[PDB]
Each structure stands twice: as structure tokens, then as C-alpha cells.
């Protein structure tokens, strides 16, 4: 019905050779999101979570160990986190189920960025 346009255009290549498993730990912990793809050395690497982007700071961790092993140790999360993690290289997007159950602690990501 509506109108637009089409394209097939790129460069690289990404081939997801380990996509992503899963995750199920207490809200406010470190939850860590492996993931193989190629090629071994691509970069940068980019990381969602059900509809929220993800960047690395004092709580976000995003590692690249070797062989294109992306590893995501997001520390505090949050029982509203629970989702599932969509990973982004190039024409690949990988899918883990993200679940978050409550933990005993408290006061941990409440509001971290006003938006």
C-alpha cells in the first residue's frame, strides 16, 4: 500500500558462527552475553536490549576476547531489563533470551540516564 524504495548495497561481510545462548541471574548482577562473529577482528560492535541501545560505561562492560568473542557483562541490571539481547554486526543481528529474576539487594538501576 505505501510507497518506497529498495537496495542491495555493502562491503563487509558478518557471519554469526556462535550466536548468543542465554542469561537468567538476579536483577542488579552481571550478566554476560557471549557471542562468535566473523570475521574475528570486526569493528566496532554494537548491542541492544529489546528496545533500548547498550554502551560501555562504569556498569555497561563490553569486552572482545580472540576470535571475534564479544562478551557484554552488563553489571546492575534490572528486573525491567529482562528481555533479550539483540546483538548488531554488519547484516547479522543475534538473539539471546535475557532473563532477569529479583535479587536480594536493593537500589540498583533505578534512573541512570534521564530519558
Not at 18 to 33: C, I, M, N, R, Y
Not at 52 to 77: C, F, K, M, S
Not at 106 to 115: H, I, L, N, T
Given at each position: 500500500?505505501?510507497?518506497?524504495?529498495?537496495?542491495?548495497?555493502?562491503?563487509?561481510?558478518?557471519?554469526?558462527?556462535?550466536?548468543?545462548?542465554?542469561?537468567?541471574?538476579?536483577?542488579?548482577?552481571?550478566?554476560?552475553?557471549?557471542?562468535?562473529?566473523?570475521?574475528?577482528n570486526?569493528?566496532?560492535?554494537?548491542?541492544?536490549?529489546?528496545?533500548?541501545?547498550?554502551?560501555?560505561?562504569?556498569?555497561?562492560?563490553?569486552?572482545?576476547?580472540?576470535?571475534?568473542?564479544?562478551?557484554?557483562?552488563?553489571?546492575?541490571?534490572?528486573?525491567?531489563?529482562?528481555?533479550?539481547?539483540?546483538?548488531?554486526?554488519?547484516?547479522?543481528?543475534?538473539?539471546?533470551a535475557?532473563?532477569?529474576?529479583e535479587?536480594?539487594?536493593?537500589?540498583?538501576?533505578?534512573?541512570?540516564?534521564?530519558?
Open positions: 500500500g505505501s510507497s518506497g524504495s529498495s537496495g542491495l548495497v555493502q562491503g563487509r561481510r558478518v557471519h554469526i558462527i556462535e550466536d548468543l545462548e542465554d542469561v537468567d541471574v538476579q536483577e542488579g548482577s552481571s550478566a554476560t552475553f557471549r557471542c562468535r562473529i566473523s570475521p574475528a570486526y569493528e566496532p560492535v554494537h548491542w541492544f536490549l529489546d528496545k533500548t541501545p547498550l554502551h560501555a560505561n562504569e556498569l555497561n562492560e563490553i569486552d572482545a576476547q580472540p576470535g571475534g568473542y564479544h562478551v557484554l557483562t552488563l553489571r546492575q541490571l534490572a528486573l525491567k531489563d529482562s528481555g533479550t539481547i539483540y546483538f548488531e554486526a554488519g547484516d547479522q543481528r543475534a538473539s539471546a535475557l532473563r532477569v529474576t535479587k536480594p539487594s536493593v537500589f540498583s538501576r533505578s534512573g541512570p540516564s534521564s530519558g
